[PDB]
């Protein structure tokens, strides 16, 4: 509770997303999705970028390499981050304009919205829009980083938020964040029935001697843990997460 | 009026440099003027930087050019324009500093203050302070652009701030932009009995037919009237401001 002046920082870097170009359901604006990957999976594996300052389809990367060869892989990226690009005036745009790329780019073949978590929340705000449109998803796919422990994960969090008021971003990225910010914060999402997988990939399975636990994901959701520590060949748990995410679709 | 959205953006601007790390007049922090140019005359032009989004010692590379075999030229920098620079606390600490930094380097040997409208009143504060402390300047020297009517300058001026929200600086010169309008914007400059020259520099040697003739300074001050078109060779408009402020100087 002590960087309160984070709260602040974002506020403002908010309060100048104001003043550039918006963009809602109303005019034409449209986005195209990214491919990351293909493989004969029946099920495509549509990736939203998350909201923090780095954030963006690079993010999927590896991920995307875990995959190719077992599904196909497109990522969704939030508008306004790149240099020129308008900022959704609400929740309410960006995932109807993303729901749009969606129900195009991809007509039938089902798939998964996923997120890295720094992207949950417009993860499954993106999967809502879907629903209501009436092209649900075939699931959400939460891949949780940062620690298990209340503290430690909330600390983690604001500890690499600072590293941004620290060799730096951009205007148009720290606009945006302050934009999304301030979007997924006031969100408020509710039940649907979309079956979800959360993926623990943060370190240490167990939260420290200290006894924290943080609050986990509300709505009906199955788990997996996959921390990154151990005996074959240490490097890229991200396989791990691949495969968990397949297996998960196919029972 | 319209563009008042400017008056936001810089109190935003303002409060993103409250985050900066700012400077008072106790901590020893201290500032190193800029050589120009050099010539016999016994009175040195201490030119002070705009608070202009662009501004700093570049802006006076003409006037000094001009003045080269002339008189010696240096130039004051407003602290924080530049990468990592503190900003002032107060419109006192930025004055006394720069204050410092001439009586420093000049000993005796005269000097006039010399800004740029944009800089007129960082120029005429530092020369308040230089006046309080013992080592008053021969004079100021005011030039200023823009245009003479109220409006059309008005319009020249809100017109070219937006110029700058279209290409575009860094938050170190935006955020020390809104820092230092809230600076200047509280300050009210008393007066004082030093020598002034206002140099109407600005095009339109009179204000468009349509009423306008903006207010000028307040506070004693002589005149002189150096327009924005010429009969001679187009673009030196400096070695005539320059040698005014020369005669000026010598009767």
């Given at each position: 509770?002590?960087?309160?002046?984070?709260?602040?920082?974002?506020?403002?870097?908010?309060?100048?997303?104001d003043?550039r170009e918006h963009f809602d359901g109303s005019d034409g604006f449209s986005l195209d999705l990214?491919?990351?990957?293909?493989?004969?999976?029946?099920?495509?594996?549509?990736?939203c970028?998350?909201?923090?300052?780095?954030?963006?389809?690079?993010?999927?990367?590896?991920?995307?390499?875990?995959?190719?060869?077992?599904?196909?892989?497109?990522?969704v990226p939030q508008p306004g981050?790149?240099?020129?690009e308008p900022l959704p005036s609400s929740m309410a745009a960006v995932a109807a304009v993303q729901a749009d790329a969606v129900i195009r780019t991809?007509?039938?073949?089902?798939?998964?919205?996923?997120?890295?978590?720094?992207?949950?929340?417009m993860?499954?705000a993106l999967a809502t829009e879907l629903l209501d449109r009436g092209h649900?998803?075939?699931?959400?796919?939460?891949?949780?980083?940062?620690?298990?422990?209340?503290?430690?994960?909330?600390?983690?969090?604001?500890?690499?938020?600072?590293?941004?008021?620290?060799?730096?971003?951009?205007?148009?990225?720290?606009?945006?964040?302050?934009a999304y910010?301030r979007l997924t914060?006031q969100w408020?999402?509710?039940?649907?029935?979309?079956?979800?997988?959360?993926?623990?990939?943060?370190?240490?399975?167990?939260?420290?001697?200290?006894?924290?636990?943080?609050?986990?994901?509300?709505?009906?959701?199955?788990?997996?843990?996959?921390?990154?520590?151990?005996?074959?060949?240490?490097?890229?748990?991200?396989?791990?997460?691949?495969?968990?995410?397949?297996?998960?679709?196919?029972?």
């Amino acid at each position: 509770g002590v960087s309160g002046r984070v709260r602040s920082y974002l506020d403002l870097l908010a309060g100048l997303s104001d003043f550039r170009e918006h963009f809602d359901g109303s005019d034409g604006f449209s986005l195209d999705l990214v491919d990351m990957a293909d493989g004969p999976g029946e099920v495509t594996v549509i990736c939203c970028a998350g909201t923090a300052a780095i954030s963006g389809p690079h993010e999927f990367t590896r991920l995307a390499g875990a995959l190719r060869g077992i599904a196909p892989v497109r990522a969704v990226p939030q508008p306004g981050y790149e240099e020129g690009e308008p900022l959704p005036s609400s929740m309410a745009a960006v995932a109807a304009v993303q729901a749009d790329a969606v129900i195009r780019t991809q007509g039938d073949k089902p798939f998964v919205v996923a997120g890295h978590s720094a992207g949950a929340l417009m993860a499954y705000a993106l999967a809502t829009e879907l629903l209501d449109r009436g092209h649900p998803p075939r699931g959400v796919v939460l891949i949780d980083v940062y620690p298990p422990g209340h503290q430690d994960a909330m600390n983690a969090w604001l500890e690499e938020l600072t590293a941004t008021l620290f060799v730096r971003m951009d205007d148009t990225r720290l606009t945006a964040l302050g934009a999304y910010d301030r979007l997924t914060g006031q969100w408020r999402p509710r039940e649907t029935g979309l079956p979800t997988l959360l993926v623990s990939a943060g370190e240490p399975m167990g939260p420290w001697p200290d006894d924290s636990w943080k609050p986990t994901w509300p709505f009906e959701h199955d788990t997996v843990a996959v921390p990154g520590d151990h005996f074959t060949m240490v490097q890229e748990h991200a396989d791990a997460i691949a495969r968990h995410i397949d297996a998960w679709l196919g029972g």
